[PDB]
Scaffold this active site. Structure first.
Site, PDB file in Angstrom:
ATOM      1  N   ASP A  86       6.265  -9.153  -2.913  1.00 12.90           N
ATOM      2  CA  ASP A  86       6.851  -7.989  -2.328  1.00 12.90           C
ATOM      3  C   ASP A  86       8.399  -7.687  -2.719  1.00 12.90           C
ATOM      4  O   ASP A  86       9.026  -7.128  -1.390  1.00 12.90           O
ATOM      5  CB  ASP A  86       6.444  -7.585  -1.048  1.00 12.90           C
ATOM      6  CG  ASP A  86       4.940  -7.465  -0.848  1.00 12.90           C
ATOM      7  OD1 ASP A  86       4.160  -8.252  -0.365  1.00 12.90           O
ATOM      8  OD2 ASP A  86       4.510  -6.300  -1.062  1.00 12.90           O
TER       9      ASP A  86
ATOM     10  N   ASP B 252       2.283 -14.329  -1.896  1.00 12.68           N
ATOM     11  CA  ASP B 252       2.867 -13.145  -0.799  1.00 12.68           C
ATOM     12  C   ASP B 252       4.152 -13.392  -0.482  1.00 12.68           C
ATOM     13  O   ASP B 252       4.486 -13.158   0.832  1.00 12.68           O
ATOM     14  CB  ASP B 252       1.648 -13.017   0.282  1.00 12.68           C
ATOM     15  CG  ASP B 252       1.849 -12.017   1.293  1.00 12.68           C
ATOM     16  OD1 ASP B 252       2.469 -10.609   0.697  1.00 12.68           O
ATOM     17  OD2 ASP B 252       1.624 -11.866   2.288  1.00 12.68           O
TER      18      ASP B 252
ATOM     19  N   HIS C 225      -4.829  -1.572   2.324  1.00 12.44           N
ATOM     20  CA  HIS C 225      -3.846  -2.608   3.205  1.00 12.44           C
ATOM     21  C   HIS C 225      -4.190  -2.638   4.480  1.00 12.44           C
ATOM     22  O   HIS C 225      -5.302  -3.316   4.818  1.00 12.44           O
ATOM     23  CB  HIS C 225      -2.308  -1.907   2.991  1.00 12.44           C
ATOM     24  CG  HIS C 225      -1.345  -2.759   3.557  1.00 12.44           C
ATOM     25  ND1 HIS C 225      -0.446  -2.594   4.681  1.00 12.44           N
ATOM     26  CD2 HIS C 225      -0.972  -4.271   2.946  1.00 12.44           C
ATOM     27  CE1 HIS C 225       0.351  -3.572   4.895  1.00 12.44           C
ATOM     28  NE2 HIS C 225      -0.053  -4.269   3.858  1.00 12.44           N
TER      29      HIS C 225
ATOM     30  N   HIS D 252      -6.696  -7.857   1.831  1.00  9.77           N
ATOM     31  CA  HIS D 252      -6.749  -6.976   2.825  1.00  9.77           C
ATOM     32  C   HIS D 252      -7.909  -6.229   3.338  1.00  9.77           C
ATOM     33  O   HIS D 252      -7.997  -5.362   4.353  1.00  9.77           O
ATOM     34  CB  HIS D 252      -5.651  -6.008   2.618  1.00  9.77           C
ATOM     35  CG  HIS D 252      -4.180  -6.591   2.767  1.00  9.77           C
ATOM     36  ND1 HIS D 252      -3.641  -6.664   3.976  1.00  9.77           N
ATOM     37  CD2 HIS D 252      -3.182  -7.160   2.066  1.00  9.77           C
ATOM     38  CE1 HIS D 252      -2.306  -7.240   3.977  1.00  9.77           C
ATOM     39  NE2 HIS D 252      -2.355  -7.413   2.697  1.00  9.77           N
TER      40      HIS D 252
ATOM     41  N   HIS E 274      -3.854 -12.255  -2.814  1.00  7.59           N
ATOM     42  CA  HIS E 274      -3.258 -13.186  -1.893  1.00  7.59           C
ATOM     43  C   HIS E 274      -4.187 -13.336  -0.619  1.00  7.59           C
ATOM     44  O   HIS E 274      -4.176 -12.548   0.612  1.00  7.59           O
ATOM     45  CB  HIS E 274      -1.792 -12.600  -1.561  1.00  7.59           C
ATOM     46  CG  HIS E 274      -1.748 -11.204  -1.130  1.00  7.59           C
ATOM     47  ND1 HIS E 274      -2.069 -10.334  -1.739  1.00  7.59           N
ATOM     48  CD2 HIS E 274      -1.225 -10.715   0.175  1.00  7.59           C
ATOM     49  CE1 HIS E 274      -1.830  -8.923  -1.110  1.00  7.59           C
ATOM     50  NE2 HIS E 274      -1.349  -9.411   0.236  1.00  7.59           N
TER      51      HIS E 274
ATOM     52  N   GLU F 153      -0.596  -2.198  -3.388  1.00  5.62           N
ATOM     53  CA  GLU F 153      -1.227  -2.614  -2.144  1.00  5.62           C
ATOM     54  C   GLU F 153      -1.486  -1.644  -1.288  1.00  5.62           C
ATOM     55  O   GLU F 153      -1.183  -1.407  -0.351  1.00  5.62           O
ATOM     56  CB  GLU F 153      -0.058  -3.542  -1.423  1.00  5.62           C
ATOM     57  CG  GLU F 153      -1.112  -4.526  -0.608  1.00  5.62           C
ATOM     58  CD  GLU F 153       0.171  -5.848  -0.020  1.00  5.62           C
ATOM     59  OE1 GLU F 153       1.123  -5.584  -0.153  1.00  5.62           O
ATOM     60  OE2 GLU F 153      -0.433  -6.537   0.713  1.00  5.62           O
TER      61      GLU F 153
ATOM     62  N   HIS G 182       0.971 -12.070  -6.252  1.00 12.99           N
ATOM     63  CA  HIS G 182       1.692 -11.200  -5.362  1.00 12.99           C
ATOM     64  C   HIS G 182       2.908 -11.579  -4.611  1.00 12.99           C
ATOM     65  O   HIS G 182       3.094 -12.534  -3.980  1.00 12.99           O
ATOM     66  CB  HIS G 182       0.622 -10.886  -4.150  1.00 12.99           C
ATOM     67  CG  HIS G 182       1.139  -9.453  -3.455  1.00 12.99           C
ATOM     68  ND1 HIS G 182       0.240  -8.349  -3.842  1.00 12.99           N
ATOM     69  CD2 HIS G 182       1.785  -9.215  -2.514  1.00 12.99           C
ATOM     70  CE1 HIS G 182       0.700  -7.428  -2.997  1.00 12.99           C
ATOM     71  NE2 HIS G 182       1.634  -7.831  -1.997  1.00 12.99           N
TER      72      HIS G 182
HETATM   73 FE   LIG Z   1       2.499  -7.184  -0.115  1.00 14.96          FE
HETATM   74 FE   LIG Z   2      -0.167  -8.050   2.040  1.00 12.20          FE
END
Ligand SMILES: [Fe+3]
Ligand SMILES: [Fe+3]
Ligand SMILES: [Cl-]
Ligand SMILES: [Cl-]
Ligand SMILES: [Cl-]
Ligand SMILES: [Cl-]
Ligand SMILES: [Fe+3]
Ligand SMILES: [Fe+3]
Lengths: 381, 381
Positions: A22, A291, A158, A200, A221, A131, A20
């Protein structure tokens, strides 16, 4: 150093595949997905833990790039849900444009074979995940089109409850794990060949999903509950059910998930978490799920995407075997993706029925009678 | 008959590629996109002008299946626009599932090479188009993802004005042809390799698009204004600009567009329209665009998808040469798709910048300052 030589050799032999990152959302935050004439900045970013120079420097073999959009905030719930769907297509669009504009560094992959071929060519195998199931706007049709656009895992939630499952960090609980929709969606995710991601999600949703799923799942993650108690971390119960499931827990670099005081978190803590999981449920069920760019600051020694060789060297220094380090790096997540796709192929080959959306009637009985009368007139010709 | 033998031979030599069929919307109307255990009905439909048995019977070589959704009606304009986007993904989903469930009859195609390979294998080359820019929810990112899902043409409007262009059947005019957004979208459609479709658009929007476009366009289902005056039909001015553009007018079987009294419309009228266009702008710029399942009833002799051999025989009976009949059948629309993709490749190869959506700022100056401060701390390490 001999171990730094050894770590460098491993990163060239097998791909380190991170669960993961972002970085696509940072591009939305900083550039607003407009990367025209921004290569100088994409290679050397003024913000964040990821850029294309440091990505090469850390010798990362592959990456599941996150197509995350925030949980809908709008008072009108239909607008917010549909907004999240449009924003998802914007994030998938910028990920594809990022890969296509930098074909020397990044190559798109959606399978085990495509990961390897990218890695043989000397490129970062660029996979995609979303996500949260808030991103599909309650549409299984949309989810299949997201799979068709190259999405290979879906985090069930999430930081918000949706129609399908409970998030970990929101109380009170809504469904108490998975809803009936959620349970039915597990079958559809297995059938289409979408990898289930349990990061999550609540502990009860994990337990239910791990028992129900016919394919191996991941934690893209997440870290270990026994070492550091947090709603986001995986319990010893769910670690054992992950073993039965044949899944992989990809260990997180989030400081809040590694230590009680966030500023004490380190590279050594990430190694403790990998070894804990590898000792108890085997090294064939552990991965790496940084992450990066889902946090402001990383642990000491894992400040950005250039720091992966220190993690590989650190694991070897602690007596984890080469073969087990290769597994933790990427062979495990490759196996899960391969098994998810094999299960989908054998379910599709058996002619299993796909899950369909609840649609409105577009025609009334008057229109349907005109159509049937018209058909019978044509039959008489 | 020798000419029926001849027509049958032509349909086997080259693919007849129809420009527009709304059979996916009939599946939404009748089944609500749930085709599980409905093969008996999909082969022999109780409604409409298309099913899989009659599709084989008419010897159709290829088809642009319409992923149409209605113009948004909702008072709240943001909801209606975003609803149309979700419905588009539902219609693209059922088209892909229809093709995948019947791989002996239908094969997906998105190019000249894929059309031919499908036709060599003895299958209907199944292409996709959307009928209106209301379907993208004002998102160029979404439009590129629709292209990625297999959409190869976009009708600029349906029966409603949008932010980009004017529909033919709505007064008053909004933009008076194309808007500034519309003009900028023409460049992006040319760059991505999306075929522009000028059916349903106003005469002024056609004139502007035909002058502006760097690739050849189509009329997926339109007829001739001189033979029958209608806002939906193509004027002699726009027919000449279509010749300069190198585009193709695919003649419609809509009865309202062929005759003043709809019930007098016939197969012979469709042939008059093809010959008119072929005489004045050459037979390399004319096609066949039935609009089957966009109407209740068809012309006499063109009642359903089984009637294409009568159209081929009718053209040969009127002294249109074999070579020109092959062009009208499918070679012309194959050429336009090939040229659209060649123009996109040469524009992409020149590094032309893509059109980006207007996005909201997700971060304020406080968050951006935290990010830049964090980056500089990492530079000091
Ligand atoms: Fe993320
Ligand atoms: Fe996250
Ligand atoms: Cl355990
Ligand atoms: Cl609906
Ligand atoms: Cl003319
Ligand atoms: Cl936005
Ligand atoms: Fe239509
Ligand atoms: Fe139409």
């Amino acid at each position: 150093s001999p171990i730094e030589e050894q770590a460098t050799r491993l990163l060239k032999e097998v791909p380190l595949i991170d669960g993961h990152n972002d970085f696509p959302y940072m591009i939305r935050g900083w550039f607003r997905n407009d990367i025209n004439g921004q290569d100088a900045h994409l290679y050397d970013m003024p913000i964040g833990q990821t850029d294309l120079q440091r990505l090469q420097k850390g010798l990362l073999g592959g990456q599941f790039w996150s197509a995350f959009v925030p949980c809908p905030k709008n008072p009108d719930k239909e607008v917010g849900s549909l907004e999240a769907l449009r924003q998802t297509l914007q994030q998938l669009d910028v990920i594809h444009r990022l890969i296509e504009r930098h074909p020397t560094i990044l190559q798109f992959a959606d399978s085990a074979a495509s990961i390897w071929s990218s890695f043989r060519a000397g490129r970062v195998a660029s996979l995609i995940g979303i996500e949260g199931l808030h991103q599909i706007a309650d549409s299984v049709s949309a989810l299949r089109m997201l799979h068709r656009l190259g999405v290979r895992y879906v985090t069930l939630t999430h930081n918000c409850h949706n129609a399908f499952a409970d998030a970990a960090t929101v109380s009170p609980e809504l469904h108490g794990g998975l809803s009936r929709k959620g349970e039915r969606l597990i079958r559809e995710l297995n059938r289409m060949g979408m990898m289930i991601d349990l990061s999550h999600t609540s502990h009860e949703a994990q337990t239910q999903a791990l028992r129900l799923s016919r394919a191996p799942v991941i934690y893209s993650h997440s870290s270990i509950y026994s070492l550091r108690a947090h709603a986001r971390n995986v319990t010893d119960e769910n670690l054992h059910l992950l073993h039965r499931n044949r899944g992989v827990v990809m260990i997180c670099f989030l400081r809040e998930l590694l230590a009680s005081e966030a500023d004490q978190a380190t590279l050594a803590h990430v190694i403790d978490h990998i070894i804990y999981a590898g000792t108890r449920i085997g090294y064939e069920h552990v991965g790496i799920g940084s992450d990066f760019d889902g946090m402001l600051r990383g642990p000491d020694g894992l400040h950005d995407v250039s720091c992966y060789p220190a993690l590989v060297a650190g694991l070897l220094e602690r007596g984890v075997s080469e073969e087990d380090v290769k597994r933790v790096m990427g062979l495990n997540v490759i196996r899960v993706l391969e098994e998810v796709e094999r299960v989908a192929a054998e379910l599709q080959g058996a002619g299993e029925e796909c899950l369909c959306d609840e649609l409105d009637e577009v025609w009334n009985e008057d229109i349907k009678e005109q159509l049937t009368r018209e058909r019978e007139r044509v039959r008489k010709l």
